[PDB]
Design an enzyme around this catalytic site. Structure first.
Site, PDB file in Angstrom:
ATOM      1  N   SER A  23      -9.492 -12.037  18.287  1.00 53.62           N
ATOM      2  CA  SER A  23      -9.065 -12.561  16.970  1.00 53.62           C
ATOM      3  C   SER A  23      -9.855 -13.758  16.502  1.00 53.62           C
ATOM      4  O   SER A  23     -10.256 -14.600  17.315  1.00 53.62           O
ATOM      5  CB  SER A  23      -7.588 -12.953  17.042  1.00 53.62           C
ATOM      6  OG  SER A  23      -7.167 -13.654  15.850  1.00 53.62           O
ATOM      7  N   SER A  70       1.445 -10.834  15.937  1.00 51.94           N
ATOM      8  CA  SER A  70       0.760  -9.626  15.463  1.00 51.94           C
ATOM      9  C   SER A  70       1.204  -8.414  16.271  1.00 51.94           C
ATOM     10  O   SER A  70       2.134  -8.523  17.069  1.00 51.94           O
ATOM     11  CB  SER A  70      -0.760  -9.828  15.386  1.00 51.94           C
ATOM     12  OG  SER A  70      -1.361  -8.779  14.629  1.00 51.94           O
ATOM     13  N   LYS A  74       5.495  -7.535  15.384  1.00 50.48           N
ATOM     14  CA  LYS A  74       5.949  -8.030  14.067  1.00 50.48           C
ATOM     15  C   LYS A  74       7.299  -7.527  13.630  1.00 50.48           C
ATOM     16  O   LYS A  74       8.048  -8.241  12.941  1.00 50.48           O
ATOM     17  CB  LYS A  74       4.895  -7.742  12.970  1.00 50.48           C
ATOM     18  CG  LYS A  74       3.508  -8.367  13.144  1.00 50.48           C
ATOM     19  CD  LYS A  74       2.707  -8.212  11.844  1.00 50.48           C
ATOM     20  CE  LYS A  74       1.378  -8.891  11.892  1.00 50.48           C
ATOM     21  NZ  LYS A  74       0.592  -8.627  10.651  1.00 50.48           N
ATOM     22  N   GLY A 136       3.248   0.764   7.230  1.00 49.86           N
ATOM     23  CA  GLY A 136       3.450  -0.088   8.387  1.00 49.86           C
ATOM     24  C   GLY A 136       3.650  -1.531   7.931  1.00 49.86           C
ATOM     25  O   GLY A 136       4.043  -1.803   6.795  1.00 49.86           O
ATOM     26  N   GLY A 258     -10.735  -6.868   3.550  1.00 47.36           N
ATOM     27  CA  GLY A 258      -9.607  -7.692   3.996  1.00 47.36           C
ATOM     28  C   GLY A 258      -9.858  -9.138   4.386  1.00 47.36           C
ATOM     29  O   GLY A 258      -8.954  -9.786   4.877  1.00 47.36           O
TER      30      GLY A 258
END
Ligand SMILES: NC(=O)c1ccc[n+]([C@@H]2O[C@H](COP(=O)([O-])OP(=O)(O)OC[C@H]3O[C@@H](n4cnc5c(N)ncnc54)[C@H](O)[C@@H]3O)[C@@H](O)[C@H]2O)c1
Ligand SMILES: NC(=O)c1ccc[n+]([C@@H]2O[C@H](COP(=O)([O-])OP(=O)(O)OC[C@H]3O[C@@H](n4cnc5c(N)ncnc54)[C@H](O)[C@@H]3O)[C@@H](O)[C@H]2O)c1
Ligand SMILES: O=C(O)C1=C[C@@H](O)[C@@H](O)[C@H](O)C1
Ligand SMILES: [Cl-]
Ligand SMILES: [Cl-]
EC number: 1.1.1.25
Lengths: 288, 289
Positions: A23, A70, A74, A136, A258
């Site tokens: 990440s 994450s 979640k 989702g 994104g």
């Protein structure tokens, strides 16, 4: 002669998910903390279903100010928290937790982050129509926020998998709690997809298609469904151009990956914990 | 690179759990060591006491932390939540260092070992000889036990008649029953016994808070003539860098050593337990001034 800024006074902000070690969130937040002179450090921990409960109870006992959440946690973490923001309760997912005097409140910043990124890029979809793929955490957060922000109509497409029932709930929530008009269709209903895209100002992918293990693949059946004036958006940013975005660019469309959503979902989380604005221009320059 | 922060999603955490604790210099020591060696770890402190301990240990298991240090008030209770103990941790009954291997937590005690290593590094050989030591708290207990396990021949402990005296009685029983070291305990007010013990010792050590705030400028030594030039006088205190005891020792010609080495070497021992790399102690000593 000390050069390490981390001392016994330094506080921790976490990130709990798995897999997660690649990440970019720690770099984003640590660079923001350092820039503003705040004595915090952000670290990721590999936490899944088996570990989540014990990790949250441990974070309570460690008195952590907050953390991000994450996959795969979640939609499960609410159980371990005390309160939920209005959006986290409507969405049914949490990506950000804040600890106020021992009371944990779950928040969701993915939707607000997506919408801010559109706005910052010059894409106005308020009062207009969106077609989106997915059901989702990301898609639900985006659909709910779009509706709350005044998008006029949302057409959702999803495959007939375990998430389809979630989209049906999202449709019900949007139609009953907002002025937005939402509907759901099967992603394999290609004639309906063509019609909905044609009638929309933006077409958004909010699924993992286009990202590993689906890199080079798309849910779009034909490029001829995309006119040049359509805005085509993807939640994916690795790769920086999904097959969908490539096809859209070839058709003459404006596109947006994104990266902005990632920055702004993080900026909002940062402000929840610190009550300070993240220096977004600075972070964008160094990381995105 | 435009990125300057070394912490990423790959960075692992080593903790420190105790209260109070935020003024500790342990994080500075380990973070400087990690950065120097290019190891991808960070060390952080958390305010953890009795009420939080169980939950924190469970949480650390679930976070898969490689390890952590433990300090007051948790050193004598944490074994309850661990899986294995080193021999000294078991015998002392305290743990200051934990390591996690495949989910199995092993408790270690490093302050005693740190004390002994610092003496050896300073050229002081106390193995097979007699030590006289003041104290019966955490530091004294770990030093006495470790010294006995390492081969010190005799240990004479002096402590006041306070709540720690009973702990010193337990330490004596442990040493005499589990090692070949000959241990005994006396009241610090027994000055004539103290004269004998020091006269026969290679080293006289202070392991009490006397000489450090709120007792700075104070000493438990009754008379300078109890010392001699061949004796080593040691203090666990290092702020100040020369307690009144060390000043008197210097005045009598003795060799002296403060507690700075103990601090550094206990950190070096824990650092290897976690990383399996050697800590650069001289480098750390220089950055800590
Ligand atoms: N840019 C950002 O900041 C940001 C934030 C959150 C999520 N995301 C991304 O959003 C994507 C979805 O994340 P999520 O948390 O909503 O996941 P999720 O597991 O909650 O949902 C997965 C969604 O993708 C669909 N899907 C998955 N595989 C499919 C396939 N082969 N064919 C058709 N549909 C498929 C599912 O039906 C569902 O709608 C991921 O790529 C994630 O990295 C990006
Ligand atoms: N160099 C190092 O790394 C290191 C490590 C640990 C502790 N220390 C130092 O060791 C000292 C003791 O620490 P501890 O954790 O063992 O403390 P503790 O509270 O566990 O024990 C205190 C000891 O001091 C005695 N004592 C206290 N006040 C006294 C007085 N006025 N007169 C006579 N005796 C007195 C008590 O009887 C007891 O033996 C502290 O100064 C501490 O900072 C140094
Ligand atoms: O991979 C990450 O670092 C993250 C991904 C998104 O799900 C975010 O919602 C989360 O806050 C951080
Ligand atoms: Cl601000
Ligand atoms: Cl303790």
């Amino acid at each position: 002669k000390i050069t390490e800024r981390i001392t016994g006074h330094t506080e921790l902000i976490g990130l709990i998910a798995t897999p997660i070690r690649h990440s970019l969130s720690p770099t984003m937040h640590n660079e923001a903390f350092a820039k503003l002179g705040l004595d915090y450090v952000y670290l990721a921990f590999e936490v899944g279903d088996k570990e989540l409960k014990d990790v949250v109870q441990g974070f309570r006992a460690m008195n952590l100010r907050g953390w991000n959440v994450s996959m795969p946690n979640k939609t499960n973490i609410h159980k371990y928290l005390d309160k939920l923001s209005p959006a986290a309760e409507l969405v049914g997912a949490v990506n950000t937790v804040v600890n106020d005097d021992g009371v944990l409140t779950g928040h969701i910043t993915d939707g607000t982050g997506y919408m801010r990124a559109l706005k910052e890029a010059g894409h106005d979809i308020i009062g207009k129509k969106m077609t989106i793929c997915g059901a989702g955490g990301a898609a639900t957060a985006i659909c709910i926020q779009a509706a709350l922000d005044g998008v006029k109509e949302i057409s959702i497409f999803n495959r007939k998998d375990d998430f389809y029932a979630n989209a049906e709930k999202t449709v019900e929530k949007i139609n009953s709690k907002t002025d937005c008009k939402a509907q759901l269709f099967d992603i394999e209903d290609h004639e309906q997809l063509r019609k909905e895209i044609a009638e929309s100002v933006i077409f958004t992918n909010a699924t993992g298609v286009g990202m590993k293990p689906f890199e080079g693949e798309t849910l779009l059946p034909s490029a001829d469904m995309l006119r040049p004036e359509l805005i085509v958006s993807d939640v994916v940013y690795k790769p920086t151009k999904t097959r969908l975005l490539e096809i859209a660019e070839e058709q003459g469309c404006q596109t947006l990956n994104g990266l902005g959503m990632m920055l702004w979902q993080g900026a909002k989380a940062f402000e929840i914990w610190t009550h300070k604005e993240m220096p977004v221009d600075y972070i964008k320059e160094i990381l995105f």
